[PDB]
Amino acid sequence: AERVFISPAKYVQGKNVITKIANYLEGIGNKTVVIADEIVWKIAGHTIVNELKKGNIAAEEVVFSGEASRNEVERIANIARKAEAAIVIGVGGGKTLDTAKAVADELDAYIVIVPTAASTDAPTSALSVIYVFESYRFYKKNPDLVLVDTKIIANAPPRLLASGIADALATWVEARSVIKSGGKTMAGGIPTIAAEAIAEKCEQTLFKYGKLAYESVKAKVVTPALEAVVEANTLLSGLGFESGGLAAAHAIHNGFTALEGEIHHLTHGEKVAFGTLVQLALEEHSQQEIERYIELYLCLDLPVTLEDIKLKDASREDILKVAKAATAEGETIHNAFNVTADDVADAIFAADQYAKAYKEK
């Protein structure tokens, strides 16, 4: 079969790089539209507009409603049309970035992605989720330019870095399972050797620098350990999951949308952490190998029990709902496993039990 690898055109990371935005946009154009929510306009939004003005680059300032819906995308796309802007700049978290990508596809515009936290690996990807999760949709392209300012990230909450590490720790576990079973990746074919090298390196980097990166953020300072972890959470994890493959961990994350409740205040990363423990319980690992992950999660104050994810004393019936959704036709778990909803419900309680046993030590 065919191997396929896709990637954003350019990735740039460093301390204060947001100050060179006008530089990177030189031979591209002079009119842009900038999208961000109220909070982010203060954090980095105004700084970006000011830098663009200094370079004679026009900038239509849009305030993201907060909901990534078709309407909001139609609303913002008209504004850009009117201003006849040829460059779209999305700044902030997940919803804002997906919306910015939808907008760029409508205008066939050059898109710049500027995350304000290294909390998920969605930044570099060509895809998003259509919701209770319903399916994955692809955009026409991966972003043209992803700009990551470590200074901004060293100021974001420590919990958001821990979340990004959790999402990135799922990368090798899931890709490895797709490679072994000969399944397909989101990109369309079997994994390339390039994606395998990137996903495996992603895990080694997190285990080596993860904790030092977490401490750096607590003190709001930029260090080599933080630079390495931010690259892992963004570029390695991004290419690794997209071109390396998804499996059970993210299917479990999706399965949680089948329930209502406080669990939905947790970040994408915190849900993925527990989901990763569930994939490990469905595989053949020794106790020491599983505890190696549990230990790192606790060090980063991430959730490892059903109680931690707001599902204390959940019923078998509740867990079966999650399991049925996670094993739905078309979910990624099928790319690497042959399991039934009942097998998965069983694995959810086993992971909870394994973690409690570790804590009781």
Residues forming the active site: 167, 250, 253, 268
| Number of other residues whose CB lies within 10 A of the CB of residue 139 | 16
CB of 268 to Zn ion, least distance (A): 6
Binding a copy of itself by CB under 8 A: which of 31, 184, 208, 334? 208
CB of 99 to Zn ion, least distance (A): 18
Query: Residue 308 annotated as binding?
Result: no
In sequence order, what are the residues at sequence separation of 6 or more whose Cβ sits closer than 8 angstroms to the Cβ of residue 205? 228, 229, 231, 232, 236
167 binds, among Zn ion, a copy of itself, none (CB under 5 to 8 A by kind): Zn ion
The answer on whether 11 is annotated among ligand-binding residues is no
52 vs 239 by CB, closer to Zn ion = 239
CB of 116 to Zn ion, least distance (A): 18
What is the rounded (10 degree) CA torsion for 324, 329, 335, 337?
40
Q: Which of 40, 252, 263, 282 binds a copy of itself (CB under 8 A)?
A: 282
Q: Pick from 37, 149, 167, 174 the residue near Zn ion by CB under 5 A.
A: 167
CA angle 123, 36, 269 (to 5 degrees): 40
Whichever of 198 and 333 has its CB closer to a copy of itself, that residue is: 198
User: Could you give the CA distance from residue 334 to residue 357 in angstroms, rounded to a whole number?
Assistant: 29
Q: Which amino acid is at 134?
A: E
Q: What is the dihedral of CA 123, 185, 160, 92, to 10 degrees?
A: 20
Among 35, 44, 88, 228, binds a copy of itself (CB under 8 A): 228
Nearest to Zn ion of 265, 361 (CB atom): 265
Which of helix, strand or coil describes residue 55? coil
Does the footprint of Zn ion cover residue 174 (CB under 5 A)? no
CA angle 53, 58, 63 (to 5 degrees): 95
Q: List the alpha helices (DSSP H) in 34-149.
A: 38-40, 46-54, 70-83, 94-107
β-partners of residue 14 are 149
**For residue 129, which of 241, 6, 5, 11 has the smallest C-alpha distance?**
241
Q: Is residue 226 marked as binding?
A: no
The annotation places the binding site for NAD(+) at: 37, 94-95, 116, 119, 125, 127, 131
Binding residues for Zn ion (CB under 5 A):
167
**Which residues of the shown chain bind a copy of itself in the complex (CB under 8 A)?**
1-15, 17, 27, 140-142, 180-182, 189, 192-194, 196-198, 200-201, 205, 208-209, 211-212, 215-216, 218-219, 221-225, 227-228, 231-232, 235-236, 239, 281-284, 286-287, 290, 338, 343, 346-347, 349-350, 352-354, 357
